Structures are given as C-alpha cells and as structure tokens.
Design a protein around this ligand. Structure first.
Ligand SMILES: CCCCCCCC/C=C\CCCCCCCC(=O)OC[C@H](O)CO
Ligand SMILES: *C/C=C(C)/C=C/C=C(C)/C=C/C1=C(C)CCCC1(C)C
Ligand SMILES: *C/C=C(C)/C=C/C=C(C)/C=C/C1=C(C)CCCC1(C)C
Ligand SMILES: CCCCCCCCCCCCCCCCCCCC
Ligand SMILES: CCCCCCCCCCCCCCCCCCCC
Ligand SMILES: CCCCCCCCCCCCCCCCCCCC
Ligand SMILES: CCCCCCCCCCCCCCCCCCCC
Ligand SMILES: CCCCCCCCCCCCCCCCCCCC
Ligand SMILES: CCCCCCCCCCCCCCCCCCCC
Ligand SMILES: CCCCCCCCCCCCCCCCCCCC
Ligand SMILES: CCCCCCCCCCCCCCCCCCCC
Ligand SMILES: CCCCCCCCCCCCCCCCCCCC
Ligand SMILES: CCCCCCCCCCCCCCCCCCCC
Ligand SMILES: CCCCCCCCCCCCCCCCCCCC
Lengths: 215, 215
C-alpha cells in the first residue's frame, strides 16, 4: 500500500515537471505549431492535479477509483487533440477533434460503466466490448493519420503513433486482469507509471514534431 | 446550512442546463464565431462539476473552501477568453488571451493567498490589494474593448461588459464581509447565486454577440 502512495507523489512531481517543461519549451517553436504543445502541458497539468487528489484520497483511507476515470475522461480526448493539432489545421482539425474526441469520451465512459459493476458481470463485459471497439477504431484512425507524410515529419509522427499504440495497451489489460485473478494492487502501480510515461512522453514527442515543422 | 446545500444542487442543475443550451445553440451561428460559445459551454461544464463536489463536500460537514477557488482559477480566465473570442481574432486575440489570462489567474491567486489566512491579517489585506488592483486593471481593459464597435455589435458588447462590471462586484464585497462581521453562511449563498448568473448569463450574451456577428 505504501508503494502505491509513493508512486502517486512521484507522478504528481513528474506531471508538474512535464507541464512546466512543455510551457517553457513552447516559446522555442513557431506560433503556428504551439497549439499541440499547449494542449500537452494542459494534459500534464490536469494529471498533476488529479494525482495530488488521488494521493490524498489514498493515505486518508477513502481511495476513489472514480478519480482515475475523471482524469481519463478529460485527458484522453485531449491527448488525441494534441496529436491532431500537429497533424491537421482548419476544418479537418475541428472535425477530427469533434469525432475522435467523442469517440475517446465514449471509450472512457463505457469503461467506467463496466468498472463500477461486479467484475465478470454483464455490465462489465458490455463496458469492455464497447470501449475496446472504440479503442480499436481510434488506433486505426491514428495509423491512417500517418499516410502521406514524408521525411522527418513521417519519422516524428511514427514515434507519437507508436507511443500511443504500445503505451496504451496496459489500460485494457488492467481492466481485464481481475477476471483472470488477483491483480488489483499491481494495476494501480502500473497505471500510474503508465500515465507518467504516456502523458509526459506524448507531450515531448508532440513538442518534437512541432520543432520539425518549425525548421 | 440547508439552503446552502439546496442552492448547490440548484447551481449544479443550472450550470448543466447552461452547458447543454450553449452546445445545442452553437450550430445556430457560423463556424468563425463559435469559439466563444464553445468556451462558454466549457466554463459552465467546469462549474457544473465543481458544484456537484461542493454539494457533496457541504453534506460532509467539513466543507472544503478551496474547491470554490479551484473553480474560479479555471473559469475566470476562460470567461475573459470567451469575451475576447467575440471581440478579437488572430494575433491580437492570442496576446490578449495570454495577458488577461495571466492577470485573471493572479487575481484569483492573490485572493486565495489572502483567503487562506486570518481575516484582518496582513496576508489577508495583501491578497485583497493585489487582487483588487488586478480586478481594476481587467475592468478597465474590458471598458476599452468596446471602442470602435458600431450599431448592433456595440449594443451586444455593452451587455457583455455590463454583466461583468455589475455582476462581479459581489465577489470582492464578499471577501471584505468577514472583517465587518459574521457573514460566512450568507456569502456562500450569494456567491452561488452569483456564479449561476455570471456564468450562464455571460454565455448567453456571448452567444447573442455571435448571432449578431453571424448576421
Ligand atoms: C496561481 C494559482 C493560484 C492558486 C489559486 C487556486 C487555489 C485553490 C486550490 O487549489 O485549493 C485546493 C484545496 O486544497 C482543495 O480544494
Ligand atoms: C493519461 C491516460 C491515458 C492515456 C488513459 C488511457 C486509458 C485507456 C486507453 C483505457 C481503455 C479502456 C479500454 C479500451 C477497455 C477497458 C476499459 C478502459 C477504459 C480501461
Ligand atoms: C464564475 C466565477 C466568477 C466570475 C468569479 C469571480 C471572482 C472574482 C472576480 C473575485 C475577485 C476577488 C477580488 C477582486 C478581491 C478579493 C479576492 C477575490 C478573488 C474574491
Ligand atoms: C516524491 C519525490 C519525487 C521526485 C522525482 C520524481 C520524478 C518522476 C519522473 C518524471 C519525469 C518528467 C520529466 C519532465 C520533462
Ligand atoms: C488544474 C488544471 C491545471 C491546468 C494547467 C494548464 C496550463 C496550460 C496552459 C493553458 C493552455 C490551454 C490550452 C490552449 C489551447 C487552446
Ligand atoms: C470523482 C468521483 C467519481 C466521478 C465519476 C467520473 C466518471 C467519468 C466517466 C464518465 C463519462 C461519461 C461521458
Ligand atoms: C462527474 C462527471 C465527470 C466529468 C464529465 C465530463 C464529460 C465530457 C468530457 C469531455 C472531455 C473534453 C475536456 C476538455 C477540457 C479542456
Ligand atoms: C471485443 C472487441 C471487438 C473489436 C471490434 C473492433 C473493430 C473496429 C474496426 C475499426
Ligand atoms: C507500464 C507501461 C509502460 C509503457 C511504455 C512503453 C513506451 C513506448 C515507446 C514508444 C516509442 C517512442 C520512442 C521515442 C524516442 C525518441
Ligand atoms: C521523458 C519521458 C517520461 C518518462 C517518465 C518515466 C517515469 C516513470 C516513473 C518511475
Ligand atoms: C468538466 C468539463 C465538462 C465539459 C463540457 C463540454 C464542453 C466541451 C466543449 C469544449 C470546447 C473547447 C473550446 C475550444 C474552442
Ligand atoms: C494552478 C494554476 C492554474 C492555471 C489556470 C489557467 C486556466 C487553464 C484553463 C484550461
Ligand atoms: C473601472 C471600473 C472599476 C470598477 C471597480 C468596482 C469596485 C468594487 C469593489 C468592491 C469594494 C471593495 C471594498
Ligand atoms: C449578480 C447580480 C445580478 C447582476 C446582473 C447584471 C445585468 C447586466 C445586463 C444584461 C442584459 C440582458 C438583457 C438582454
């Protein structure tokens, strides 16, 4: 139980560092590519706040699984937005933002729907199935987003895509874990680590893409 | 105590109502003038969320006074943004957003600094002066913003400006109340009512300006 607490504080500090790093480095890219960088720092700042609330809620003996999903419902759509903001602009950006944003919201909501039921129950499987399908629909969209890119942009986008494809697998895995057995304490540890890597990492890589686009 | 709880619940409903009204209504204006409407819906959505937490917190017995400031620090800057979204575009917008945003953030921060100390204390008066100066600077900026507007836009903007000018006076007044005397229960009530009116109201008027700009 102490490790779980300690990791919430480590994440708190990492998310803040990520936020301030990204805000500081935003001045280093051309204004027309800063949007993604700004949304990235926002994601990290939201996560910074929620990890503080998670950490307080854990050492007080009241730990709300709820606070995790509140974070995800905000940050997951925004993480798609970070990415779309460096791959698109104009009407096409506003369209993907709406369409992918809604899909990411539905994924997390289906998740929460299933999570708040008995594991193995019908609600649980329904949640999994609908979120998993939306997850797949999003990963496919993200894979399609790279087609047409050239040179250093293609390489920069390849890194953002692969961070999400590989890095986000742990979330559905964790959801499934407990029907396979007793993986409850470990899931909380792994998700925290994952969140730090996925949110600071993606910000960094969005910042790298924006620099490429600025040279 | 009971009225305060009651009002929290009413606010929660009112903020949600406002959010859905503004999102539904966003299709009725041209894409180029929707931004301010979208931010106004966001503003209402954030307050919806915080008022649910404020309600639940109030029922605890031990009510967290910081929740209010968490909402303000997010929403107050966004309200200035939703205003600048209908009075500005391009570079000017982005600059005003940064600077008025910072200013608004500082105002609420000073407030919080002073609110988290003894009433009458040194810390208290410092928070007040800094927040008030910043408030004054903002209102003076808001006033200047209408210059050059003609006809129906000048009228629509007069309404935005007067909602903020008149509607936000209650906040610093409530801050000073405690040093006159015992006003803790009533302040909560008045801030709640004010928030509904200022947040939903401003959204409606930004929508109305967007409609005017839409022809
Ligand atoms: C600059 C930020 C200024 C700080 C203003 C916002 C602080 C309010 C706050 O976050 O308090 C949290 C409290 O501990 C739980 O509700
Ligand atoms: C910063 C946080 C991130 C990127 C969180 C991502 C979470 C997911 C991709 C969750 C996915 C889920 C499914 C695909 C199925 C099971 C239900 C969820 C919500 C755990
Ligand atoms: C939706 C919430 C709104 C529009 C809240 C507005 C809050 C203020 C304008 C607060 C202002 C303050 C000062 C001018 C001085 C005393 C400290 C504050 C923060 C209460
Ligand atoms: C509780 C003490 C923790 C202090 C150090 C934790 C750092 C975690 C790793 C975060 C990496 C983010 C880098 C930002 C750029
Ligand atoms: C509690 C949440 C803390 C928020 C910190 C966010 C700092 C990011 C800077 C604002 C950028 C907003 C997004 C701009 C693009 C539109
Ligand atoms: C912090 C207390 C728990 C609040 C529940 C948060 C659930 C968010 C996911 C639902 C999204 C619906 C669309
Ligand atoms: C208690 C309910 C939790 C909040 C519900 C929010 C549902 C919709 C979220 C949409 C995500 C986009 C966030 C944009 C923030 C900037
Ligand atoms: C159990 C999940 C079912 C996955 C189907 C997803 C196919 C999506 C095509 C885009
Ligand atoms: C416990 C979950 C941890 C998952 C993290 C996996 C990291 C994925 C790596 C993606 C590739 C990015 C490489 C960029 C270097 C420049
Ligand atoms: C820079 C990318 C983010 C790396 C985060 C790793 C920290 C894991 C916590 C232990
Ligand atoms: C807790 C947050 C609830 C959000 C309610 C839904 C509002 C979504 C629209 C976001 C608009 C972003 C503004 C950029 C234009
Ligand atoms: C704790 C500092 C928060 C900065 C507030 C700026 C508003 C970001 C809104 C999205
Ligand atoms: C230019 C307009 C400035 C308006 C300032 C309004 C002052 C009201 C503040 C409340 C009184 C504090 C004591
Ligand atoms: C909080 C106290 C209420 C103050 C309301 C101020 C009204 C400003 C004008 C708006 C005009 C709307 C009519 C069309």
């Amino acid at each position: 139980e102490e490790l779980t607490y300690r990791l919430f504080m480590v994440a708190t500090v990492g998310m803040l560092a990520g936020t301030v790093f990204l805000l500081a480095s935003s001045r280093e890219v051309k204004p027309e590519h800063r949007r993604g960088v700004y949304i990235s720092a926002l994601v990290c700042g939201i996560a910074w706040y929620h990890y503080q609330k998670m950490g307080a809620s854990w050492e007080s003996g009241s730990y709300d699984t709820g606070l995790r999903y509140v974070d995800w419902v905000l940050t997951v759509p925004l993480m798609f937005v970070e990415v779309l903001a460096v791959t698109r602009k104009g009407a096409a950006y506003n369209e993907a933002v709406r369409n992918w944003g809604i899909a990411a919201t539905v994924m997390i909501g289906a998740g929460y729907y299933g999570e708040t039921s008995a594991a193995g129950s019908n609600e649980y499987w329904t949640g999994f199935v609908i979120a998993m399908a939306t997850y797949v629909w999003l990963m496919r969209n993200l894979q399609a987003e790279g087609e047409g890119l050239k040179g250093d942009q293609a390489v920069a986008f390849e890194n953002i895509k692969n961070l999400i494809l590989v890095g986000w697998i742990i979330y559905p895995l964790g959801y499934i874990a407990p029907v396979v057995g007793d993986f409850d304490a470990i899931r909380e540890v792994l998700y925290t680590i994952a969140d730090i890597i996925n949110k600071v990492g993606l910000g960094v890589l969005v910042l790298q893409m924006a620099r490429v686009q600025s040279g």
